[PDB]
Amino acid sequence: GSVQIVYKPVDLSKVTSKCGSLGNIHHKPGGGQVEVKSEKLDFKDRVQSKIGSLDNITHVPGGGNKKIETHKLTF
Amino acid sequence: GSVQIVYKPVDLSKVTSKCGSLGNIHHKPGGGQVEVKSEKLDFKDRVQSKIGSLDNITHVPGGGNKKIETHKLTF
Amino acid sequence: GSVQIVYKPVDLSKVTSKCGSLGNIHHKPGGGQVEVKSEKLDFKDRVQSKIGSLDNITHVPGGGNKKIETHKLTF
Amino acid sequence: GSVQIVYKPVDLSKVTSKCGSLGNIHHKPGGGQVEVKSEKLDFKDRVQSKIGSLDNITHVPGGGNKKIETHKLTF
Amino acid sequence: GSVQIVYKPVDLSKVTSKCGSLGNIHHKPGGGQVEVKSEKLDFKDRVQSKIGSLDNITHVPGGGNKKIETHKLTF
Amino acid sequence: GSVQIVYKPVDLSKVTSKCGSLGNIHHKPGGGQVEVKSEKLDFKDRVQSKIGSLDNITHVPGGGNKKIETHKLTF
Amino acid sequence: IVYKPVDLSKVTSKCGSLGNIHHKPGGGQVEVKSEKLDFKDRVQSKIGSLDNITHVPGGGNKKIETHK
Amino acid sequence: IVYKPVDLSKVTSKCGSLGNIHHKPGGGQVEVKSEKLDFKDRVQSKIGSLDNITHVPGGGNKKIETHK
Amino acid sequence: IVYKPVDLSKVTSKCGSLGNIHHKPGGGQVEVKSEKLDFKDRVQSKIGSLDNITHVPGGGNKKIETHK
C-alpha cells in the first residue's frame, strides 16, 4: 500500500468595510446666515466652540478588518 | 509503502477598508455669511474655537487591516 | 520506502486601506463672508483659534496594514 | 414748459436650459454577455447594425436659447 | 407746466428648462444574457438592428427657451 | 424751455445652455463579453456596423444661444 | 406633269421583352431533400433559378413601294 | 396634272412583354421532401423558380403601296 | 416632266431583350440535398442560376422600291 495526501484549500474570499460618507450627492446645499452676539459672559472651565453656516463632518474610528487563517497538516 | 504529500493552499482573497469621505459630489455648496460679535468675555480655562462659513472635515482613526496566516506541515 | 513532500503555498491576496477623502468632486464651493469682532476679552489659559471662510480638512491617524505570514515544514 | 424722460429699464433675468444627463449616479451598472450567431443571410438594401453589452447614449439636439430684445425711445 | 416720465421696468424673471435624466440613482442595474441565433433570412429592403444587454439612452430634442421682449416709449 | 433725456438701460442678464453629460458619476460600469459569429452573409448595399462591450456616447447637436438686441433713440 | 409623292411613314415591329422593370425579383427560399428516388427517363429540374427567356421567330417587316 | 400624295402613316406591332413592372415577386419558403419515388417516364419539375418566358412567332408588319 | 418623289420613311425591327432593367435580380437561397438517387436517362438541372437568354431567328427587314 501507499499514502497520498493532497491539501489544496482555495481562498477566494472578500472582507470589506465601507464606512463614513460614500457616494452621496449634495446639490446646491445652502447654509443660512449665522449671527452670534455675545456680551458679558464668564467661563470658569474649558470651552470648546464651533460656529458655522454649512458643515459636512465624517468621523470613522471603526471599519477595521481582522482576518486570521491557520493551516495545519500533520503526518 | 511510499508517502506523497502535496501542500498547495491558494490565497486569492482581498481585505479592504474604504473609510472616510469617498466618491461624493458637492455641487455649488454655499456657506452663508457668519458674524461673531463678542464683547466683555472672561475665560479662566482652555479655549478651543472654530469659526467659518463652509467646512468639509474627514477624520479616520479606523480602517486598519490585520491579516495573519500560519502554515504548518509536520511529517 | 520513498517520501515526497511538495510545499508550494501560493499567496496572491491583497490587503488595502483607502482612508480619508478620496475621489470626491467639489464644484464651485463658496465660503460666505466671515466677520469676527472682539473687544474686552480676557483669557487666563491656552487658546487655540481657527477663523476662515472655506475649509477642507482630512486627518488620517488610521488606515495602517499589518500582514503576518509563518511557514513551517518539519520532517 | 420743460420735459424730462428717464429711461432706465433694469434686466437681471436668467434664461437657462439643462438638457441630457445631469448629476446622476450610475453605481456598478452591468451589461451581460451578448452572442450573435448568423448563417445564410442576404441583404438587398442598406443595413445599420449595432451590437454591444452596455450603453449610455446621451443625445441632445435640443436645449439652447433665444433672447430677442428691443428698446425704442421716440421723441 | 412741465412733463416728467420715469420708465424703470425691473426684470428679475427666470426661464428654465430641465430635460432628460437629472439627479437619478441607478444602483447596480444589470442587463441579462442576450443570444440572437439566425439562419436562412432574406431582407429585400432597409434593415436597422440593435442588439444589447443594458441601455440608458437619454434623448432630448426638446427643452430650450424663447424670451422675446419689446420696450417702446413714444413722446 | 428745455428737454432732458436720460437713457441708461442696465443689462446684467444671463443666457446659459448646459447640454450633454454634466456632473454624473459612473462608478465601475462594466460591458460584458460580446461574440459575433458570421458565415454566408451577402450584402448588396451600404453596411454600417458597430460592435463593442461598453459605450458612453455624448452627442450634442443642440445648445447654443442667440442674443439679438437693439437700442434706438430718435430725436 | 408634276409628280412629287412623299413617303414620311413609319413601319415598326417591337417584339419580345422590351422596357420591363424587374426590381429585386428574388425568390422563395428553397430546400429540396431527396432520398432513394429512381428515374428511368429524362429529367428537367429547375430549383430557385430566375430564367428570363425570349424567342422571336417573328417581328419581321416588309415594305414594297412602286411608281409609274 | 399635279400628283403629290403624302404618306405620314404609322404601322406598328407591339408584341410580347412590353413595359411591365415586377416588384419583389419573390416567395414563401418552399420545401420539397421526397423519399422512395419511382418515375418510369419523363419528369419536368420547377421548384421555387421565377421563369419569365416570351415567344413571338407573330408581330410581323407588311406595307404594300403602288402609284400610277 | 418634273419627277421628284421623296422617301423619308423608316422601317425598324426591335426584337429580343431591349431596354429592360433587372435591379438586384438575386434569388431565393437554395439547398438541394440528394442521397441514393439513380438516373437512367438525361438530366438537365438548374440550381440557383440567373439565365437571361435571347433567340432571334426573325427580326428581319425587307425594302423593295422601284420606279419607271
Q: How far is D21 from chain A (nearest CA, A)?
A: 15
Query: What is the SS3 assignment for I68?
Result: coil
Contact (CB, 8 A) for I46 and G51? yes
Q: How far apart are CA C3 and CA A75, in angstroms?
A: 12
Residue whose grid cell is 409623292: G5
Contact (CB, 8 A) for C17 and B17? yes
Contact (CB, 8 A) for I52 and I14? no
Backbone angles phi, psi at E49, to 5 degrees: -125, 145
Contact (CB, 8 A) for G3 and I3? yes
SS (H, E, C) chain F: CEEEEEECCEECCEEEEEEEEECCEEECCEECCEEEEEEEEEECCCEEEEECCEECCEECCCCCEEEEEEEEEEC
Q: How far apart are CA F11 and CA A24, in angstroms?
A: 38
CB contact under 8 A, C35 and B35: yes
Name the resolution in angstroms: 3.0
Residue whose grid cell is 439679438: F68
Q: How far apart are CA D73 and CA A14, in angstroms?
A: 76
Backbone angles phi, psi at F17, to 5 degrees: -125, 125
Of D57, F31, D21, F54, the residue nearest E57 (C-alpha): D57
| Other CB atoms within 10 A of residue F20 CB | 21
Within 13 Å, how many C-alpha atoms sit on residue C44's CB side? 11
F-chain residue closest to C25, CA distance: F23
Contact (CB, 8 A) for D5 and F5? yes
Q: What is the dihedral of CA F56, F57, F62, F64, to 10 degrees?
A: 70
Q: How far apart are CA H49 and CA H27, in angstroms?
A: 9
Q: How far apart are CA E63 and CA E22, in angstroms?
A: 13
Q: How far apart are CA F68 and CA D65, in angstroms?
A: 11
* Touch criterion met for H and I (3+ Cβ pairs within 8 Å): yes
Q: Calculate ∠ Cα G57-G19-G49, nearest 5°.
A: 75
| Other CB atoms within 10 A of residue G50 CB | 25
Residue whose grid cell is 503555498: C9
Q: How far is CA A14 from CA A19, C14, C19, in A?
A: 16, 10, 18
Give me the residue from G15, G36, G44 closest to H45, CB to CB. Answer: G44
Question: How many CB contacts within 8 angstroms connect chain E with chain F?
Answer: 7
User: What are the beta bridge partners of residue B66?
Assistant: A66, C66
Q: How far apart are CA D28 and CA A18, in angstroms?
A: 15
In chain G, residues with a C-beta closer than 8 Å to the C-beta of E42 are 26, 29
- Residue D46 in contact with partner chain I when CB distance is under 8 A: no
Q: How far apart are CA I58 and CA G29, in angstroms?
A: 37
- DSSP codes of every residue in B52-72: EEEEEEEE-S---EEEEEEEE
Residue whose grid cell is 438701460: F9
Is E12 buried (19+), middle (13-18) or exposed (0-12) by CB count in 10 A? exposed
CB contact under 8 A, A67 and B15: yes
- Residue A62 in contact with partner chain C when CB distance is under 8 A: no
Q: How far apart are CA B20 and CA C67, in angstroms?
A: 23
User: What are the beta bridge partners of residue F29?
Assistant: none
Contact (CB, 8 A) for A11 and A68? no
Backbone angles phi, psi at G15, to 5 degrees: -130, 135
- DSSP codes of every residue in E44-63: -S-EEEEE-SEE--EE-S--
In chain B, residues with a C-beta closer than 8 Å to the C-beta of C59 are 58-60
| Other CB atoms within 10 A of residue I67 CB | 10
Task: Give me the count of residues in chain C.
Answer: 75
- Select the residue from A24, A60, A66, A69 to test the C interface by mutation, using most C Cβ atoms within 10 A: A60
Q: How far is A66 from chain B (nearest CA, A)?
A: 5
Q: How far apart are CA A33 and CA I3, in angstroms?
A: 121
Task: Give me the count of residues in chain D.
Answer: 75
CB contact under 8 A, F14 and D14: yes
CB contact under 8 A, D27 and A27: no
CB contact under 8 A, D25 and F25: yes
Q: How far apart are CA G10 and CA I10, in angstroms?
A: 5
Q: How far apart are CA I46 and CA H48, in angstroms?
A: 12
Residue whose grid cell is 448595399: F45
Q: Calculate ∠ Cα A23-A28-A29, nearest 5°.
A: 80
| Other CB atoms within 10 A of residue F39 CB | 10
Query: Which DSSP letter does residue D29 get?
Result: -
Sort residue F29 into left (φ over 0), alpha (ψ -120 to 50) or beta. beta
CB contact under 8 A, I28 and E40: no
Q: How far is C5 from chain A (nearest CA, A)?
A: 10
Q: Which chains touch E (3 or more CB pairs under 8 A)?
A: D, F, G, H, I
Q: How far apart are CA F2 and CA E3, in angstroms?
A: 11
Which segments of chain G does DSSP mark as H helices, in order?
none
Contact (CB, 8 A) for C8 and B8? yes
Q: How far apart are CA G17 and CA G8, in angstroms?
A: 28
Q: How far apart are CA I68 and CA G54, in angstroms?
A: 43
Contact (CB, 8 A) for H26 and E44? yes
Contact (CB, 8 A) for D22 and F25? no
Which amino acid type is present at position G11? V
- Residue E39 in contact with partner chain G when CB distance is under 8 A: no
Q: How far apart are CA F39 and CA D48, in angstroms?
A: 18
Cell numbers given for B41? 468675555
| Other CB atoms within 10 A of residue E56 CB | 19
| Other CB atoms within 10 A of residue I66 CB | 9
Q: Calculate ∠ Cα I20-I23-I29, nearest 5°.
A: 125
Which amino acid type is present at position F56? N
Cell numbers given for F20? 450633454
Query: Which DSSP letter does residue B33 get?
Result: P
Cell numbers given for D59? 443625445
CB contact under 8 A, C27 and B30: no
User: What are the beta bridge partners of residue A50?
Assistant: B50
User: What are the beta bridge partners of residue A17?
Assistant: B17
| Other CB atoms within 10 A of residue B69 CB | 20
Which residues lie closer than 8 Å to A6 by C-beta, 6 or more apart? B6, B8
Strand G6-7 vs strand E10-11: parallel, antiparallel, or unpaired? unpaired
| Other CB atoms within 10 A of residue D74 CB | 11
Contact (CB, 8 A) for G21 and I19? no
**DSSP3 helix / strand / coil % (chain A, rounded to 5):** 0, 70, 30
Of C48, C58, A33, the residue nearest B50 (C-alpha): C48
Q: How far apart are CA A56 and CA I9, in angstroms?
A: 103
Q: Calculate ∠ Cα B25-B26-B29, nearest 5°.
A: 170
Which residues lie closer than 8 Å to C58 by C-beta, 6 or more apart? B20, B58, C20, C21
Q: How far is F47 from chain C (nearest CA, A)?
A: 42
Q: How far apart are CA A5 and CA E16, in angstroms?
A: 74
I-chain residue closest to D45, CA distance: I24
In chain F, residues with a C-beta closer than 8 Å to the C-beta of B23 are 25, 27
- Residue G34 in contact with partner chain E when CB distance is under 8 A: no
| Other CB atoms within 10 A of residue C6 CB | 11
Residue whose grid cell is 441565433: E37
Cell numbers given for H22? 415586377
Q: Which chains touch I (3 or more CB pairs under 8 A)?
A: D, E, G, H
Q: How far apart are CA F50 and CA D50, in angstroms?
A: 5
- Residue D22 in contact with partner chain A when CB distance is under 8 A: no
Task: Give me the count of residues in chain G.
Answer: 68
Q: How far apart are CA B7 and CA A8, in angstroms?
A: 6
Cell numbers given for I45? 438541372
